[PDB]
Structures are given as structure tokens and as C-alpha cells.
Amino acid sequence: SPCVAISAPGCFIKGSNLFSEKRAGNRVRFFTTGRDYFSDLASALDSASSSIFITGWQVNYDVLLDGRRSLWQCLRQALERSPALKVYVMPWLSPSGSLGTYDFETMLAVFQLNAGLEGGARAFCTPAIQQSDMQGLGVAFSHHQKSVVIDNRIGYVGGIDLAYGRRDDNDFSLDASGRRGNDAYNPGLPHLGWMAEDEHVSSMGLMMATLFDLSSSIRAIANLIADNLDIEPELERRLRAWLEELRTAALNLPEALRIKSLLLINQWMSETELGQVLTLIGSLFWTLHRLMQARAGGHQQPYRYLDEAPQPLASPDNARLAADQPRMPWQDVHCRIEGPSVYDLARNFIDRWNGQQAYLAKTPALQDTALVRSALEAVMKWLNSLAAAAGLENYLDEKRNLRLELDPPTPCWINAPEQLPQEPEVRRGGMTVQVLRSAAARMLEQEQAGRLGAGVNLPLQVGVSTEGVQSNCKDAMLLAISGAQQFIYIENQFFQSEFGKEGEVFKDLPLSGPMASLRDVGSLRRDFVVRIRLEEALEQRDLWLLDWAEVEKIAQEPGTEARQFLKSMLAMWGVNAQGWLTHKLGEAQHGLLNEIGEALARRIERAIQREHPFHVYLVLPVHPEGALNVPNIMHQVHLTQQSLVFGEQSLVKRIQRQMALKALEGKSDPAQAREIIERKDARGRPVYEQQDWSRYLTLLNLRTWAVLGGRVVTEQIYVHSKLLIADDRVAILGSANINDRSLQGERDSELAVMVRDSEPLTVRLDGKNDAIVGKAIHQLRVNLWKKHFGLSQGPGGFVKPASELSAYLSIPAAQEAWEAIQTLAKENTRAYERTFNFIPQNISQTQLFEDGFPASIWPTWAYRKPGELRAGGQLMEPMPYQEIFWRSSNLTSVKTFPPPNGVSGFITALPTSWTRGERNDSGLNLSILA
């Protein structure tokens, strides 16, 4: 019975900003591997006969779905099979190609789906502009939903984008050598191998096959700005004199020349509309979009390297992981839904699509159209010059006499009855599903305008809202947390949640040693810094104010220190400058806003008060995907550790204070009790820190290791899931991270489902007392635990199965279960740390403080002076984000590592002391990181 019935109060969310109401009668299939979701999707695309809707934060056309065909090939085969079928692809329109989503390339690939299709175009791609309420900071926000709907009858939703690196299985293999192109995925490592140019498609190759029917960089960028220059009259004159100076420069440019080049180039890419399009590679973009869509659609056949000879997309520099370099394994959860709630998934896609169409199709003012037209001629001047240089001049000549292409961005509505879903009849039984959104007030307004423009008003349930911010994902998590009776299991990419005041940062250390090395001018060599007047140029936020005469003399100064200084100085400038920009774009919040951490602690506090058992499992990534020496990554780690342990009102401290206060219950009245528990102990720590919070909370990371190319290697298993289970009775699955960006509702858009199974299963969650739970929810958690314990892998692993834990799979609320899980995780971590000093961990192994010195954000870092921590420091041994970790240099040789001994399962302990004392503040606007 517990929450089984559809009238049961407190089981699904209600209130004033619902995207949907719960519906019974669904069939849900859960995917616990990306391989299984992609394989299931390929099969469903092979059945599609009417419509295919795809939206995602990242959509990569060349990703293999079924081991043989790309997403693109599966879409093309469906269009050829079903003459009435239409395809719509809505990837997030990222503001920079540097985010690695490749939406621009996928867009061109989608255009090619129409090449040679009998009849008109039936494949459409509209990349989706963020519709947040964050005003000037909107550029930092995204559409983060991951959803696919086929024939308005099969709906997919969860955390898995159709993207590089997402496909993976129960082996979490580190070998990347069989992955194709960018699907060999590890953003934290330098990529020291080569993608052969004749086996990979370049973006330019793809553009060239879009425009025509084919069936150092400083001097390079300079000669490009030259041809399109003949712009604010001041920048023109600097660019006038700049070009003349290059024409007489030496093969090796003077340093002052080489830096004012990158200042002038950076001004061009950011200020003029032409360079603004290349950084995306304005309504210039949409006019280009229409032109390219129309050209590709007239071609006789799709580009050969999409279909006849499918090759992966290359990376921008054709670098890839070398044979000895590990991929980063991908942990994620997704599902497939059939039944009434597919209607709500279809409604999300259709209303979003039509809202984007209404937005982009608005007519500009004549003076704006005149600027877009002018920039388009140049953009088409640039693209046509590359084509000439690529030996495609004959294709250029054949188009000389055609009509000037400038058709207006026109709305492509989804409004034919065949593409629209039918309002479902009420059902009973099966799975009850409620579709949840995070969506900004601005988003809902554009959706209303798309309903008006397309003439589409899909019937809504009563009490569904079409106005105001939707924060359904946060509200459903809060409901599940407060309603939980025995335990909660959470997998999430993030734990960033309101934690009170920042805590534990060492006095006399305004910035951590590592962060100061990236941000703080006082960490550079002072004699070079004072000579070029760097400090003062930073104070006035203008790099032109350096003493360029001293810049060139240091540039010639022989040895190591002088060549290095200018490099680090310029990198520091960029970090500082990004900090200044993000604070100018919009107001910064103070601290984190979402209350997930408080709500988990509040539920544990109730257990403490009642003297009842309760437990929360949190499974999180070791650290955000990417390299640990990137400031925004370092800052997210900082906020994670504050949210979990170091903040004054962190999850662990909220729990410990409540345990301490209960120990004093009756003995003392309040107010005084709150002061007695703060009294500092022998080592200077508040006495409530003696409370064993591990009775209530287990924190886990995932890790594996292998011998790759004759070398011992390790990598985090990236927990990308966004999954919450309570009591094996409800699952919340979707795209919403535990951070402000996902949960507040007015920032990134998100999509999720709350699922309950009406099919009962009798279990003993705590090992003793019978409980009726949801059969498929229970099975989902059991499958995830089998996977993380190493019980689902095939033969030939380096990590053994943790078969000692199979006894606990069905009793997650038993104290014996979490105690066994904690013990094995701690033992795995000890085995890893015996050989790897560079992984996140509690105690520094290189600094050589009763337990020792806490390990730094860069674990091989040591501070020069324990007394004056602001004296700086250095990496004592390489970090994996460095090339010398992987490849010998003239003075260093590649260090090796003994294999870990005794690791069973992939679970490891989250290091609750990692970075204690360090303020890893990137200087970026906290609202962008929150």
C-alpha cells in the first residue's frame, strides 16, 4: 500500500507550477548502462513510422548506437523506410565550440539527412537557445534535458545524452583503443595520440559538403582578418598598423608583437559579428542556418563519409587518447516509457520546439537586416575562399549565377495532426509516472508564444501551469526525502547545496597554493612582475599598460624562467579577466541556495529525535569531469566539499550537531545546549565532531584501474546519473543535478520523471521487517548495486567482484549493509592510496595536524613553508593532467606505479578531508558555478 494508490496524498508533487500531473498505466524500462539505452533506442528507431523527436544538451551525429551504425545512419534508414516519417533534432545551441558539444557539426549532419530524399525535406534541426531568467548571465546557461520520443508513443528520459563517452557497460573498461574519434573520452587527460586525417571527418570537410554537392596560427588568423577588414574606426586603425608590422616581422615574432596580436585578435573575435559567428562555430547565425539547410537539402546524395563510408568526427586538433591512456568510464541511468505519460514528454518537446520557432522567426528592424545581409556576404566571402583553397573552385563556379540566397528565417511548426499526440484516457495499474521540469518563466512565455504561432494547444490536466518558474525536480526530491521511511539512495553528478558560512579555510591563506598559482600575481617571479608593471595593469584591468620594452627584454633573457613567465602571466590574465567579466554580466549570489542538503539532514534529524534507524547513501564522482588544474573545476570541488563536510551548515556538521544535541536531551535546556556542543576539544575541534555520523550517511566515489599498454593506470568512474530512490518505492530519474543551476528552476532547463511501480514485492529492507515495495524500483537499485560492487562484469577484469556484498543487495536499510559497504569502500581506498599519491585523498603523501597534513586539490602539491602557507609551493610529483605523467621529456622519465592489491568492487570512500584549509576560489561569478 505505501503510496501505491493514485489518490494517496504525499506521493507525487502538487502545487502551483506543475508541468504535469501523475498518470497511472505506464510501462517503464530502466537502463543501468549507456550501451543498453543506445541499443534499445536503435531498435526503436528501426520501428519508427511517424515522428522522431530528439533533444539534448549534447547530440553527436556520429555516435554508434548498436555497435555498427551511427545515430545519423539510424535516422537516415528510418527516413528511407517510412515515407511519412519526420525527424526533429533540438540540441542545445552552445555559445562556444570550446564546450565540446559539437552542435554545429550535428546540425550540418542533420541537414544532410534530406540529401536525395524523394520529396521535400523531412529532417529538421533547430539548436535551442537558453531561455533562462538569468538576464546578462544567460549566456552561461543551457538546455540540459535529455529526451527522445518516437511516434509519440515511446518516450526516453534520464541522464544520458546521445553523446561521446556515454556508451559504457558493467565492465567500466579503461581501454580506449577501440573507441572511435571523440568517443574515446577523458576530458581530464592530455590527448597524446593522433586521429588519422583520412579516417576522420573534419568540421571544415563537413561544412564544405554542406555548401557544395561533392557526390603558426597567429600569422594565419592575421591574413584572415586582413581580407575581410576592408568595424569601429579605432580598432580598424590598430588593425591597420598591426598588419603592416607583421609584413616586416621576423619568422619568430617579438614578444610584444606576439602578445598585442592576441589582444587584437581576441578583440576581433568578441566584438565584430564576423568573429562572433566563428566563436560559435546573432540573427546572422539563423540566416546562415537557413542557407545551409537549403543547400544540403538540394544535394543529390548525402556526404559520402556520413553514409557510404561513415567515419567519426575528428577532434579540433586531431588529438586523441593514446593506447596507454585510459578512457574515463561513464556511470549513468536512463529509462524508456510507454503509456499515458509519454504525452507529457511529447508535449515538452513540441512546445519547446514551437517556442524556438516563434522566437527565431521574428522580423528584425530594417537597419538590423541590413547589417546581417552585409555580414552574410563576408561570411560567404570567407567560406567561399576556404573552398577555393580546398580545390573546390569548380563547385564555386557552378553557383555563380544562382539567385542571391537570403530567404527569411521562416517558422517550421510541429502542428500537423500526425505529429501531435492524442490526450490519453485514464488508466490504472502499471507504473505511475509524473513528468517534472525545471523551466524558467521566460521559457514558459516563449512556449506560450509558440502555441499561438503554431496553433497548437495540447490539452492539459487540471492544475497544470503554463506560467511562472517550474521547479518540479527540486520539489519532487524534497517530497521523496521527507516521505522516506527507511533509506534513501542517491546517484548524482553534483552535491552543491546550501551549507551556511564557508568553513575550515586556513587563516593567513586567502587562496590555496594551487589557485594562487593560477590567479595571484604575487605567485609569479617578483622581478619579472615589477619590471613589466603587471600588478598595476591588473589593477586597471588593461593589459596594454604593461611596459612592453621590458616585455621584450625578458623575452630574450636566456634560460628557463624567462620563457615560462610570459606564458603563466598570460594564463593568469585570462583567469582574472574571466572573473571580471562574469561579475559585470550580472549580480553574484552569496553562497548556495537549494535546500537538498538541509532537507537530507532534517530527515536524519527526525530519525535521531525518534531514536529510529535511517540511512542515506550518496554516490558521487571523485571530481567534476575535466582536469583538476582548471579553476572552474577546482571551484566546484571546493563547493562540493563545503556542501558535504566543511561548510558551517554542511551535511555532515548538521547531522553531528543534531546527534550531539540529542545526547544532551533533558540533561540541559536549549540555547545553552547549542553552546555546550560548540566547546572546543583538546585538538581545538568542537566537541560535536565526536558524533559518528556514519550511522546515518555513507559517501561513495567510484574508481577502477587497469594495466594499459604495459602501464598501471587508474581513473574515476564518472557518476553522471541524476537518480534518487527512497525505500525501493519511488525513483526520481532525469537530468537534474544537485546544484542551483539544475534545481532553482530559473537557470538551466531540466526534465525528469518520478516513478512508482504498482506491482508489489515483499522484502525486508532492514533485514528483519517485511515491507511491500515497488518491484521494478527494487530491481533498479539491486542492479545498480550489483554493477558498483563489480558483480555484473564479464571475465578478465583487474577489479575483482565484491561477492562479500551480494548478501546485502536486498537489505539496504540494514545497519549490517551500510557498515559492510563503508568497510569495503575504505579498504579499496587504502589499497589505491598505497600506490597512488596523486588521487584525491584525505592525507597528503608529499608534504613530507594530528592525523597529518590534508591533501591539496592537487594531491602531489606541497606547501613550501607550513608556517607561512602563503610562501607558495609546487607539485612534488606529476599530476595526470600533465604530459610528463605520460611521456618522457629531456630531463624527466615516466614514473611507474605498482598495481593496487586487493581492490574488490568499484566503490571507494569519498575523502572527507580532501582540500581542508584551501580556498579554491576561481574568482568566477558564483551564480555561474552554483
Numbering used by the authors: 24 to 238, 328 to 342, 346 to 396, 417 to 983, 993 to 1074
Paper quotes:
PldA, a phospholipase D (PLD) effector, catalyzes hydrolysis of the phosphodiester bonds of glycerophospholipids—the main component of cell membranes—and assists the invasion of the opportunistic pathogen Pseudomonas aeruginosa. As a cognate immunity protein, PA3488 can inhibit the activity of PldA to avoid self-toxicity. PldA is mainly composed of 27 α-helices, 25 β-strands, twelve 310 helices, and many loops, folding into three regions: the core catalytic domain (CCD, aa 24–935), the peripheral helical domain (PD, aa 215–441 + aa 647–721), and a small C-terminal domain (CTD, aa 936–1094). Compared to the open conformation exhibited by PldAFL (pre-open state), PldAtruncate presents a highly open conformation (open state) and the PA3488-inhibited PldA reveals an almost closed conformation (pre-closed state).
Here, we have determined, for the first time, the crystal structure of the full-length eukaryotic-like PldA (PldAFL) in the apo state. Close examination indicates that the reactive His167–His855 pair resides in the loop connecting β4–β5 of the HKD1 domain and β17–β18 of the HKD2 domain, spatially in the vicinity of catalytic Lys169 and Lys857, respectively. Moreover, the imidazole group of His855 from the HKD2 subdomain, mediated by two water molecules (W1 and W2), indirectly forms a three-hydrogen-bond network with the His167–Lys169–Asp184 pair, thus stabilizing the active site. The conformation of the active site region is almost identical to that in eukaryotic PLDs rather than prokaryotic PLDs, indicating a eukaryotic-like catalytically active PLD conformation of PldA. In PldA, the main chain carbonyl oxygen of Ile1072 forms a hydrogen bond to the side chain of Arg876 from the α24 helix, which is adjacent to the conserved HKD domain. The B factor (The scores are negatively correlated with the stability of one structure) of the PD region is extremely high, suggesting that this region is structurally dynamic; in line with this observation, molecular dynamics simulations of PldAFL showed that the positions of these helices fluctuate. In PldAFL, the α11 helix stacks against the α4 and α9 helices, and these two helices clamp the α3 helix connected to the lid region, thus stabilizing its conformation. In PldAFL, the lid region forms a short 310 helix (residues 120–122), packing with the β2-α2 loop and the α8 helix. In such case, the lid region is positioned distant from the entrance of the active-site pocket, which becomes accessible to the solvent so that the substrate can gain access. Our structures of PldAFL and the existing hPLD structures show that they adopt an “open” conformation, with the potential lid region draping away from the active site and allowing the accessibility of the active site to the solvent and the substrate.
